[PDB]
Amino acid sequence: EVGVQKCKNALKLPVLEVLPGGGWDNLRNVDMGRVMELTYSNCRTTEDGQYIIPDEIFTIPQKQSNLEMNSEILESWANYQSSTSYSINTELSLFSKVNGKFSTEFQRMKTLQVKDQAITTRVQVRNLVYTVKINPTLELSSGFRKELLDISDRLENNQTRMATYLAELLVLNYGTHVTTSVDAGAALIQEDHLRASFLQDSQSSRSAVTASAGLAFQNTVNFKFEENYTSQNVLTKSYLSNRTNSRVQSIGGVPFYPGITLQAWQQGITNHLVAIDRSGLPLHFFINPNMLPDLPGPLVKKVSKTVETAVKRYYTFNTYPGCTDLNSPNFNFQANTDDGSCEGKMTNFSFGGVYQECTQLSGNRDVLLCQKLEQKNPLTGDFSCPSGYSPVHLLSQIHEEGYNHLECHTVCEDVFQVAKAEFRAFWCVASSQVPENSGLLFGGLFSSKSINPMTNAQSCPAGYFPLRLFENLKVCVSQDYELGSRFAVPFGGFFSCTVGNPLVDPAIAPSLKKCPGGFSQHPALISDGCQVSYCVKSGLFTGGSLPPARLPPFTRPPLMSQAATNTVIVTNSENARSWIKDSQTHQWRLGEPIELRRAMNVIH
Ligand SMILES: *[C@@H]1O[C@H](CO)[C@@H](O[C@@H]2O[C@H](CO)[C@@H](O)[C@H](O)[C@H]2NC(C)=O)[C@H](O)[C@H]1NC(C)=O
Ligand SMILES: *[C@@H]1O[C@H](CO)[C@@H](O[C@@H]2O[C@H](CO)[C@@H](O)[C@H](O)[C@H]2NC(C)=O)[C@H](O)[C@H]1NC(C)=O
């Protein structure tokens, strides 16, 4: 009777299913959430009179069709097109080199070029139909507004670390962007993975390699599965043998099946439209005082910074620097940003061992946290490096833990305390000159959220034994040289978001935050908003499957160990405006100059 169905019964038309306004994760090219409010109250149609659109949506009829007879050769996977999200991946931003590189299309493309030494060629029929954009005058959604009125309450009850936790669930549900224009259409793509040596000799006839790749596309679609082709003349007998992989996908329209005339495919584009391109803006662009009218002025510029910080923390994590050049040695497969760490010489370093101390700040009774958090060296004894080494700091933070008393008088009431314990986690560095023995070996780390790539499980190898360093992490270590020399990998040092390692620039801003030359860096155990890394040189830690995207949240949910401070008056000093909250938690109205002076006396 109201909403969509009133416009749909009166008009008898389909609804356009390619709509903007929704969110967009930009690492994994997936769509999620609904940021903008789409209401169908005026019963608008497209100017064709064929679909039904929302009110705050205007369409531009493209009615365009592209048909190319040549494939485009896309070697060197570091710069690639996405064919569905090319306009939103290549924005001018500081993280343009990480966009798109966790989507499902990229992790397939990167694997087939390294595991086969291949290049890729796509050929496509584009069929762009509309361009669907949002108006500038537009309001936020009903559910997206509610979760910004919860970030702005924790920031005014003086609860940081809970407002950071809710701004990292905001990015989990609504992505990093908001699509502001989509493109309803339907492509038809064929990707081939040719062998890379097949292109190097055909420098002149590279225009004939692609001319047969675009003719093998049209014989696959037009003729049936039975080979009645017209392309097998001279060179489409090595081309069939030099290829390593082939697939054909369709994005809109009727489902593709091999042998369907290109006439018959293009008559199913109607009523089956998808976004074959999209553009967008960042997520914190839409947190501003004219999208949120009832909140105060400078309070939504602080929500916009808390949500901006959680997007930049989701791109700083999921960034793997390493040697990207494929023909070189020290090629890191998991790396998705070039570091310049190729062609470097390595130096074998020896490390003393890690240790850790606890302090047990608050809850000295009923919970004893300084047993689980404490760890000694395996080769020294107490909390110290051995004789020829030196300690560095690497991290220091607080481990909270809730418990329960129960004071019975039968009536009983229970009190919920919290027990804190600050832990400091050192590691040792070879100072001047150490002989070849008298040092622990290394067998890789494994956290509780990860695995050791020596044994492909959460376990140290044979002969090795773990020792705890950051309340979940286990460093596999053995002191032997006959039975533990098979699983030993050379070690380059820990560093963090604060303290870089001193093993770069030898014989020594403290230092840089990177590995020495020839070593690859790997993340291990993000521990409350700061990640610690470690440098190795194996090639076994390098290989394997590509890592999935590490989704937020990264902080554990806090234990509410901070009291709330009720804020009433909000002001800025530079234009003399004030927003006085009324009684019984109603709203934020603007402050008249006769009531704020009567309200500052009860504050301070
Ligand atoms: C607002 O919250 C912050 C964060 O907890 C408080 O800052 C800390 O307060 C404790 C209380 O003694 C101090 O020990 C810390 O040194 C403070 N940290 C910093 C960085 O200042 C702050 O006190 C709270 N403000 C109010 C009015 O409650
Ligand atoms: C991969 O491509 C190479 C071309 O770079 C093919 O090598 C040629 O194959 C033809 C087939 O008769 C020979 O006559 C040529 O002498 C080969 N060499 C060159 C330099 O052209 C190779 O055959 C292809 N791979 C497969 C498995 O067929």
Author numbering: 11 to 614
Task: Give the published text.
Macrophage-expressed gene 1 (MPEG1, also termed Perforin-2) is one of the most ancient and highly conserved members of the membrane attack complex (MAC)/perforin-like (PF)/cholesterol-dependent cytolysin (MACPF/CDC) superfamily, with orthologous sequences identifiable throughout the metazoan. In contrast to other perforin-like proteins characterised to date, human MPEG1 is an integral type-1 transmembrane protein. Each monomer of the 16-subunit ring possesses an N-terminal MACPF/CDC domain, a central multi-vesicular body of 12 kDa (MVB12)-associated β-prism (MABP) domain and a C-terminal region (termed the L-domain).
This mutation resulted in two different MPEG1L425K assemblies, one of which involved domain swapping between the two head-to-head coordinated rings. The L-domain forms substantial inter-subunit interactions in trans with an extraordinary elongated β-hairpin that extends from the MABP domain of the adjacent subunit (the MABP β-hairpin).
